[PDB]
Design a protein around this ligand. Structure first.
Ligand SMILES: CCCCCCCCCCCCCCCCCC(=O)OC[C@H](COP(=O)([O-])OCC(O)COP(=O)([O-])OC[C@@H](COC(=O)CCCCCCCCCCCCCCCCC)OC(=O)CCCCCCCCCCCCCCCCC)OC(=O)CCCCCCCCCCCCCCCCC
Ligand SMILES: CCCCCCCCCCCCCCCCCC(=O)OC[C@H](COP(=O)([O-])OCC(O)COP(=O)([O-])OC[C@@H](COC(=O)CCCCCCCCCCCCCCCCC)OC(=O)CCCCCCCCCCCCCCCCC)OC(=O)CCCCCCCCCCCCCCCCC
Ligand SMILES: CCCCCCCCCCCCCCCCCC(=O)O[C@@H](COC(=O)CCCCCCCCCCCCCCC)COP(=O)(O)OCC[N+](C)(C)C
Ligand SMILES: CCCCCCCCCCCCCCCCCC(=O)O[C@@H](COC(=O)CCCCCCCCCCCCCCC)COP(=O)(O)OCC[N+](C)(C)C
Ligand SMILES: CCCCCCCCCCCCCCCCCC(=O)O[C@@H](COC(=O)CCCCCCCCCCCCCCC)COP(=O)(O)OC[C@H](O)CO
Ligand SMILES: CCCCCCCCCCCCCCCCCC(=O)O[C@@H](COC(=O)CCCCCCCCCCCCCCC)COP(=O)(O)OC[C@H](O)CO
Ligand SMILES: CCCCCCCCCCCCCCCCCCCC(=O)O[C@H](COC(=O)CCCCCCCCCCCCCC)COP(=O)(O)OCCN
Ligand SMILES: CCCCCCCCCCCCCCCCCCCC(=O)O[C@H](COC(=O)CCCCCCCCCCCCCC)COP(=O)(O)OCCN
Ligand SMILES: CCCCCCCCCCCCCCCCCCCC(=O)O[C@H](COC(=O)CCCCCCCCCCCCCC)COP(=O)(O)OCCN
Ligand SMILES: CCCCCCCCCCCCCCCCCC(=O)OC[C@H](COP(=O)(O)O)OC(=O)CCCCCCCCCCCCCCCCC
Lengths: 64, 546, 443, 108, 117, 125
């Protein structure tokens, strides 16, 4: 306590309850994080879908 | 002479950190560090004249093979070509003056030889990075400068904010390092080799350029990765000069210029957004080192756009890198001298007059500031005007918006650099400590970088200097008018009453605060879930009481 | 074989030394583990790398117990013979010396056996030794010992009838004829997955490791981390992949998702740990998940890269356990809140801690960097996203590693003094091995 | 001010000596009771698990959710690898009899 | 609005803290000290125009409005002297506390320096 | 000036919170959160709602011009064609998807070169 009159004392305490985040906030932020940090997975899934729909068009208009 | 540019700063670091330094002390270690940088600079000068001017590249098999399993073959091999010679000349020349400065700036530090050894290791890993001929020895250099940046940013380890700044630099760069590693996997898989001369790509699979761009955006501190760069001011002033001039931030731009496998839309958009963002960020700061840090981020944005423009744009990007290193290191060294003359204060509201600094420090700040703002027929004028004129004739419609962003950024840069000079010297005194530094070593350190600024005007970086891209006088001389507008506004010292815009920009758009809870707190909470609910909960098997 | 009998009989003579001769007991038990290191180095000298896959064979009649050397077994045997004298330097009683001597006999014979029933007999004969080592009365934990023994017994009991099923199916448990006969691969594949997914910590059967690897003494932690986890990997590479390959293809999505969730969830748990030994203990699960996925990729040079990662982990994580053990031995706690400023008070120990922290995070000039690059080459060649998952999550490993280092090493200097000569020489062979295998591993 | 060595080496235990000998336990930490209590509680945190609303919801969406995401990604990668290698549809566990294990004597 | 510490103060010290923080925030928002002097004079004249009040409701309304203004205009980058908390020179190279030394620890009780079992 | 005074941080003298490892106590006063701005008052008293509200306008203010020029402006805005090359030099230069010579609307294979510069992501089989 020899420096409390120079740099401040220990009377003011931290205002935080150390509690977990709310469930909806955690879910929404995790879904945004999955979308941002795993964007090659969505890009490649979209590539597979766009490729298979073209083969569907070919197989549809070919056998007619 | 060729291997002396790479090995020998690493040797200086090894000497000054080992128990050999217990016999030399501070006094002997300063001599060892300065000599070990002078030799490497002389070697790099010889390499520069041989390779750039006489066009004779040299390839050295140094330590045999590193590892070779299947068709994945990594060798301990260097290659010294035009880009490598450019980078080696720049890195060793800047690091020599920074060592000469640091031997006097950190004189009163208790562990001076440890600091000098860390600086030498950082320089040597940068030399290893640019001298490598394949991707894996490049990754040695990449992670080596990352580790040495961690050691040097958090040098004053008893201060918690410095420790957290070093950890932040490591983590932000670790994200981009992961993406760069995945890109190296793509490149090797679809081309069959790791050496640069066998990596000629016309049309690749998109993930290659994107992931290598993300890995470069980490080190060059572009948008959504710039957050570590401002906090890296916790380290001492020589660390900041070497981070912002020659090492670390120029590595991603070097990698993109070397590979040339990007897709230009992402590169142009990222670079121009970064330039405008860092321009408005540096206009609203009062910490003397943070303004210079944001100007570094802005110029890296300029170089990013230029390498987006094309092969000529890639050459202009390397040219602006080379000329930027000299005046940026000079700016940081002059700012360190001004800080030491004012009792350690870094706020520009507590400066003024011409008593707290030497005449040479004020001259250094003035000349490097004039080169940065593109004053005509100085060093930065040639490279910055080349990039601006190349952006004014690109046939991509995206480059139309990028050019406008660059012109606005140029006006902002001439505003806040003139503000940095005005607050430091022109206004009345508002500090209380006048201890001006006039030692020989930091003055000679500044004089060397000013000589390099003159050298870039006298001898160009490449053949683009003097080539005329044919533009009307209105398009050509507009950046001069934007420089004058910034100077007049900053000397008038005018301000606006829109305080909510002022506090949105001065708080740097809240990127750190939004990152404190969009990935970070969720990572902590998901760890709580995986431990408490999973390991202790759902998967836990209890005992059978009897 | 005659040499192995002589080495066992020389090692077992520690019991007959009268206890009042302290110097002789120490020297005899240390030399009894030094000699097999020389013999295994000689076996590496004798190996013909352009010859057959199996060399130096011996088979003991109709008793199972057949032995042979390949590259994976030879590298793992070299690592074990390095690690056991360091364990001898960390013990003080004849009971400890004898437990580690019996463990060395069982590990060395299990690493190179070519019979499945012989592997079963040799490996889990170490169960009661591990129970007594972990649940030692004043300073161990009986809960941890019960957990590790019961999980291992559960997996082994799932395997044992399938072992006997293929034995009745073809007539032998020799791996050279088990790989050439027609067998019902789904049943035996499930039995082998059951043992080796407990030995390698794979979720959900992984909860024994955080208790056991922390409750163990420093020598026990060095052995358990650096050696005993890799018996699951050599189980995969020697027995399961050659004998049930159709199962090994069909189970790949399940093994793949187990490896991915083990890697991610164990990395997420490591961040919330507050015990230094528990921090070091969790980090091993993610590395073993990368090992298992690289083994199961079977794609480019998968055995090579996965064995090299096993060696790199077995060098780096025992050194971290050694540094935590020094801190616990001379400060009587393993709690992070009691340690700060260890750079000023233990500069050599903190430098070693930093170097092995960088090694554990797979930075270059350490064998983990080469290992993780080649493991991700093997994973990438099946699909690019299975490599991307490990690539993008590198910030999560560095977060816990640098957070633990920065919390205990910097700040206000409080804590014990720097390392002694003995502690430095316990650390030192691992550092030399790391520098060599990370700079010039091959010729 | 203890004396644990003779002038020619020869460690002395100092069992009956007045001065406190420096030894292995000299730098053992003084335990803070609340820190010991918090570490004990975190060591036995499995006694605090309860199936309330938040525990059930987070164990469903994160643990089961990401496990199902990883299984779907693994099957996607397996099928895409088999298509990009010239293979037909291959038999994973529970997938009806089909092709497993390509033949090396065959060109795909 | 004021923090829970300032709301617990006596009225005289509450007004004093409000004037002091107003002067400091005017320092933080100004370019120089010579810019700050007439703003300090204007803030002083602003407080002098409410000195002779007696109605506690009007006093409370003025006090609460000024505290809302000070919560609005809290600078994001305050000017702190470097060697104090929040400064750039705080906690850099402190003197080491006394750390104890054990001489010749390996030589004490040799042959019995492991872990018990 | 090495050896400056610094205030020490007190030890816990009350029961600890369950998730106490979100505070960084290094030994000196003051400690910090494990990540800055995760809890406690933000600088300038701003909040997350402030930044998200200002960004919900400012983000479209920055993304507006790029969209306009990428969808409503093309190669013909330029007063000149790109740099001209002999056929043997040009034919390798425009193989790069990166090249700015694909914006040559006077080339006889302008469309085919633009159709070959479409970015793909998954390499097909
Ligand atoms: C950069 C610094 C960042 C923070 C400062 C915010 C500046 C924004 C601004 O509009 O200030 C004008 C601001 C005027 O604000 P003000 O003086 O408080 O208000 C006007 C008067 O009340 C009364 O003035 P007036 O009515 O006589 O007219 C002045 C004003 C028009 O004033 C009005 O009446 C506003 C009506 C709007 C349409 C006209 O004129 C204009 O602004 C026209 C365009 C020039 O100009 C200055 O006096 C400050 C000059 C400092 C440099 C700014 C020069 C422009 C820089 C261009 C790049 C923008 C970068 C920022 C990106 C945004 C994120
Ligand atoms: C017959 C079982 C004998 C073998 C196991 C043994 O000795 O357990 C004794 C021991 C008896 O302890 P206890 O003090 O009576 O407490 C009973 C549970 O804690 C009961 O606590 P609870 O209220 O949390 O139990 C509900 C239980 C839901 O229970 C189940 O899921 C039962 C379905 C099992 C059938 C298999 C499919 O949910 C879980 O505990 C998590 C989901 C389990 C997956 O059982 C356990 O430690 C729990 C068994 C849970 C099995 C799954 C383990 C996951 C890995
Ligand atoms: C599956 C292959 C085995 C590879 C496992 C990884 C090994 C880790 C380290 C890599 C070193 C590479 C060494 C290459 C040359 C050595 C000899 C050699 O060829 O290797 C042997 C085996 O190599 C070894 O045993 C390497 C030993 C590595 C273990 C090192 C760790 C232990 C040292 C600890 C530290 C000691 C420090 C002491 C100093 C104070 C056989 O492997 P292959 O060439 O694949 O066999 C050929 C296959 N066929 C016969 C069918 C044609
Ligand atoms: C002793 C005589 C009886 C032994 C019968 C053992 C049957 C199996 C019991 C469970 C397995 C325990 C094996 C532990 C071996 C290592 C060990 O600790 O050895 C012992 C002695 O163990 C042996 O008997 C070693 C010789 C047998 C193995 C080697 C020869 C055959 C191979 C060392 O002496 P202490 O532990 O100090 O003995 C004190 C006894 N007590 C714990 C009760 C306080
Ligand atoms: C080939 C390389 C071999 C080694 C070369 C490097 C050694 C030269 C630098 C010597 C150590 C620098 C520190 C030093 O000498 O400090 C003095 C600075 O000395 C100098 O005058 C500057 C150093 C010499 C000039 C710079 C040499 C560096 C090499 C680069 C030259 C580029 C041009 C301090 O001042 P003083 O001793 O002159 O004055 C004493 C004081 O007033 C009373 O207490
Ligand atoms: C019940 C007994 C205890 C448990 C069973 C132990 C079985 C013996 C150990 C493994 C025996 C094979 C050793 C590996 C090897 O390659 O051996 C060959 C090479 O010999 C060696 O160099 C053996 C080295 C032994 C030590 C190396 C480690 C292996 C196991 C260690 C056991 C002892 C460890 C002591 C630790 C304290 C065989 O030589 P050979 O001349 O008998 O065979 C050649 C031919 O076929 C004729 O039969
Ligand atoms: C904790 C981290 C510390 C970081 C340390 C710094 C960063 C290091 C990063 C890279 C480390 C690589 C070290 C490799 C060591 C030797 C490997 C090669 C072994 C060998 O036998 O090779 C021969 C040795 O040659 C030679 O070695 C040359 C012969 C002797 C002449 C030069 C002497 C060396 C002077 C170096 C000064 C200080 C430099 C500091 C790095 C060269 O021949 P080959 O068989 O490969 O054949 C091919 C070309 N002929
Ligand atoms: C007072 C404030 C006026 C602001 C404009 C700057 C001074 C320009 C004076 C002027 O009218 O010049 C015109 C420039 O316009 C143009 O055609 C150029 C428009 C863009 C110029 C911006 C940069 C100005 C230089 C600083 C005519 O130009 P001229 O007929 O004299 O030009 C050929 C001889 N060189
Ligand atoms: C699934 C994969 C998820 C990928 C992203 C994960 C990011 C996890 C970060 C964990 C941080 C734990 C350690 C920690 O809090 O350290 C802080 C680092 O902050 C930080 O790391 C803050 C920056 C976080 C940015 C992360 C993304 C950057 C690229 C954007 C895309 C200290 O540093 P501090 O924040 O207290 O700094 C103070 C200097 N003033
Ligand atoms: C570890 C986490 C790593 C992942 C991080 C983030 C990645 C986000 C990925 C999001 C998309 C994943 C891929 C899904 C779209 C592609 C689709 O491929 O095809 C699926 C895949 C491919 O179909 P096919 O290619 O036509 O055969 O479909 C399937 O065959 C699987 C369908 C069922 C999947 C869920 C099964 C239920 C598992 C429950 C696990 C919970 C246990 C809890 C115990 C506690």
């Amino acid at each position: 306590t020899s420096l409390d009159h120079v740099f401040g004392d220990n009377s003011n305490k931290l205002n935080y309850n150390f509690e977990p985040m709310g469930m909806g906030s955690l879910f929404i932020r995790t879904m945004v994080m999955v979308g941002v940090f795993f964007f090659p997975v969505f890009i490649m899934i979209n590539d597979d879908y766009k490729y298979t729909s073209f083969l569907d068009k070919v197989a549809a208009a070919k056998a007619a | 002479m060729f291997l002396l540019s790479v090995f020998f700063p690493l040797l200086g670091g090894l000497v000054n950190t080992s128990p050999i330094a217990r016999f030399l002390g501070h006094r002997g270690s300063s001599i060892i560090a300065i000599g070990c940088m002078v030799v490497a600079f002389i070697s790099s000068v010889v390499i520069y004249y041989e390779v750039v001017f006489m066009g004779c590249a040299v390839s050295v098999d140094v330590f045999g093979t590193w590892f070779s399993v299947g068709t994945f073959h990594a060798g301990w091999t260097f290659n010294f070509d035009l880009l490598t010679a450019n980078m080696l000349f720049t890195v060793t020349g800047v690091s020599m003056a920074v060592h000469m400065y640091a031997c006097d700036y950190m004189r009163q530090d208790p562990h001076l030889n440890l600091f000098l050894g860390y600086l030498s290791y950082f320089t040597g890993f940068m030399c290893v990075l640019v001298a490598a001929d394949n991707l894996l020895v490049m990754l040695v250099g990449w992670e080596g400068i990352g580790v040495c940046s961690y050691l040097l940013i958090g040098y004053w380890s008893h201060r918690l904010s410095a420790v957290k700044s070093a950890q932040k630099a490591i983590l932000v760069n670790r994200v981009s390092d992961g993406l760069l590693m995945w890109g190296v996997l793509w490149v090797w898989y679809h081309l069959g080799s790791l050496e640069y001369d066998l990596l000629n790509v016309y049309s690749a699979s998109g993930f290659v350029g994107l992931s290598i761009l993300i890995g470069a955006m980490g080190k060059s501190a572009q948008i959504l990765f710039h957050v570590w760069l401002a906090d890296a001011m916790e380290g001492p002033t020589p660390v900041s000069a070497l981070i912002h001039a020659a090492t670390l931030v120029t590595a991603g731009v070097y990698l993109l210029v070397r590979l040339h496998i990007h897709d230009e839309m992402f590169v142009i958009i990222v670079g121009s957004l970064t330039a405008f963002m860092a321009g408005v960020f540096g206009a609203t700061q009062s910490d003397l080192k943070r303004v210079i840090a944001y100007s570094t981020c802005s110029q890296l944005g300029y170089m990013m756009v230029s390498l987006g423009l094309g092969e000529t744009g890639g050459e202009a990007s390397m040219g602006h890198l080379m000329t930027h290193a000299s005046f940026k290191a000079a700016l940081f060294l002059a700012a360190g001298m001004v800080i030491s003359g004012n009792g350690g204060n870094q706020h520009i509201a507590r400066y003024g007059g011409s008593a707290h600094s030497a005449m040479f420090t004020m001259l250094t700040l003035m000349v490097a500031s004039l080169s940065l703002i593109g004053w005509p027929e100085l060093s930065g004028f040639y490279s910055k005007e080349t990039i601006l004129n190349l952006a004014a004739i690109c046939a991509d419609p995206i480059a139309d918006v990028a050019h406008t962003l660059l012109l606005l950024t140029a006006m902002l840069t001439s505003a806040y650099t003139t503000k940095l000079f005005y607050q430091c010297f022109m206004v009345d005194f508002s500090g209380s400590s006048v201890t001006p530094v006039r030692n020989v070593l930091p003055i000679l350190a500044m004089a060397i970088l000013l000589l390099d600024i003159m050298l870039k005007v006298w001898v160009g970086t490449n053949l683009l200097s003097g080539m005329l891209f044919f533009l009307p006088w209105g398009v050509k001389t507009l950046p001069f008018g934007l420089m004058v507008a910034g100077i007049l506004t900053a000397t008038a010292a005018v301000g606006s009453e829109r305080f909510t815009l002022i506090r949105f920009c001065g708080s740097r758009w809240g990127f750190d605060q939004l990152f404190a809870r969009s990935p970070v707190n969720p990572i902590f909470d998901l760890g709580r879930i995986t431990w408490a609910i999973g390991d202790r909960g759902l998967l836990s098997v209890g005992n059978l009481r009897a | 074989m005659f040499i192995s009998v002589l080495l066992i009989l020389f090692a077992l003579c520690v019991t007959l030394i009268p206890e009042a001769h302290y110097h002789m007991v120490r020297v005899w038990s240390f030399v009894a583990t030094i000699i097999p290191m020389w013999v295994v180095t000689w076996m590496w000298w004798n190996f013909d790398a352009s010859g057959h896959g199996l060399q130096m064979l011996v088979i003991l009649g109709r008793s199972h117990l057949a032995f042979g050397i390949d590259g994976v077994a030879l590298s793992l045997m070299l690592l074990t013979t390095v690690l056991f004298p360091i364990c001898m330097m960390l013990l003080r009683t004849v009971a400890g010396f004898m437990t580690f001597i019996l463990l060395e006999v069982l590990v060395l014979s299990a690493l190179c056996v070519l019979d499945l029933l012989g592997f079963y007999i040799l490996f889990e004969a170490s169960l009661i030794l591990l129970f007594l080592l972990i649940g030692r009365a004043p300073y161990g934990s009986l809960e941890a010992a019960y957990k590790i023994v019961l999980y291992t017994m559960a997996g082994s009991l799932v395997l044992l009838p399938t072992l006997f099923m293929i034995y009745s199916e073809c007539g032998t448990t020799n791996v050279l004829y088990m790989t050439c006969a027609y067998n019902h691969q789904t049943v035996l594949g499930w039995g082998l997955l059951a043992v080796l997914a407990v030995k390698i910590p794979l979720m959900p059967v992984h909860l024994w490791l955080p208790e056991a690897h922390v409750a163990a003494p420093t020598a026990g932690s060095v052995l358990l981390a650096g050696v005993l986890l890799k018996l699951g990997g050599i189980g995969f590479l020697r027995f399961m992949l050659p004998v049930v390959p159709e199962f090994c293809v069909s189970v790949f999505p399940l093994v793949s998702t187990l490896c991915l969730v083990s890697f991610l969830f164990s990395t997420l748990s490591t961040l919330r740990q507050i015990d230094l030994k528990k921090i070091v203990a969790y980090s091993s699960i993610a590395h073993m998940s990368m090992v298992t996925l690289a083994i199961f990729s079977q794609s480019e040079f998968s055995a090579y890269s996965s064995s090299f990662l096993m060696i790199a982990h077995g060098l780096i994580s025992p050194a971290l356990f050694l540094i935590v053990g020094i801190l616990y031995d001379r400060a009587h706690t393993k709690f992070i809140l009691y340690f700060s400023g260890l750079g000023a008070s233990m500069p050599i120990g903190s430098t070693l801690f930093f170097l092995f922290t960088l090694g554990n995070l797979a930075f270059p000039l350490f064998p983990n960097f080469i290992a993780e690059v080649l493991c991700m080459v093997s994973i990438f060649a099946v699909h690019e996203l299975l490599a991307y998952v490990f690539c993008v999550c590198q910030v999560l490993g560095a977060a816990y590693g640098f957070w633990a280092f920065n919390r205990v090493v910097h700040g206000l200097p409080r804590g014990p003094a720097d390392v002694t000569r003995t502690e430095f020489h316990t650390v030192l062979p691992l550092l030399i091995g790391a520098v060599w295998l990370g700079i010039k591993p091959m010729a | 001010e203890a004396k644990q060595f003779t002038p020619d080496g020869k460690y002395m235990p100092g069992i009956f000596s007045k001065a406190k000998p420096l030894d292995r336990s000299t730098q053992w930490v003084h335990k803070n009771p609340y820190i010991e209590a918090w570490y004990y509680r975190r060591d036995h945190f499995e006694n605090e698990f309860v199936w309330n609303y938040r525990t059930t919801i987070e164990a469903l969406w994160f643990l089961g959710g990401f496990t199902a995401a990883a299984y779907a990604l693994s099957v996607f990668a397996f099928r895409q690898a088999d298509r990009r290698s010239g293979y037909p549809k291959r038999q994973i566990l529970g997938d009806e009899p089909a092709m497993v294990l390509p033949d090396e004597r065959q060109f795909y | 609005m004021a923090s829970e510490v300032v709301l617990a103060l006596p009225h005289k010290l509450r007004v004093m803290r409000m004037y002091r923080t107003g002067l400091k925030e005017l320092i933080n928002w100004s370019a120089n000290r010579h810019e700050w002097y007439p703003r300090a004079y204007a803030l002083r004249q602003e407080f002098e125009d409410s000195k002779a009040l007696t109605d506690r409701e009007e006093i409370r309304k003025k006090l609460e409005h000024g505290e809302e203004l000070l919560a609005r205009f809290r600078h994001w980058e305050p000017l702190i002297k470097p060697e104090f908390v929040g400064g750039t020179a705080y906690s850099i190279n402190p003197a080491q506390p006394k750390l104890k030394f054990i001489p010749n620890y390996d030589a004490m009780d040799e042959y019995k320096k492991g872990d018990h079992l | 000036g090495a050896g400056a005074p610094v205030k020490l941080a007190p030890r816990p003298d009350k029961p600890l919170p369950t998730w106490y490892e979100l505070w960084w106590d290094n030994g000196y006063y003051p400690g910090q959160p494990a990540a800055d701005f995760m809890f406690g008052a933000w600088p300038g008293n701003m909040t997350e709602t402030y930044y998200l509200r200002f960004w919900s306008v400012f983000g479209l203010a920055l993304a507006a011009p790029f969209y306009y020029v990428a969808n409503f402006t093309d190669e013909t805005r330029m007063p000149m064609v790109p740099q001209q090359y002999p056929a043997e030099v040009r034919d390798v230069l425009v193989q790069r998807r990166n090249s700015m010579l694909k914006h040559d609307f006077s080339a006889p294979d302008f469309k085919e070169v633009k159709d070959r510069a479409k970015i793909y992501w998954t390499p097909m089989y």
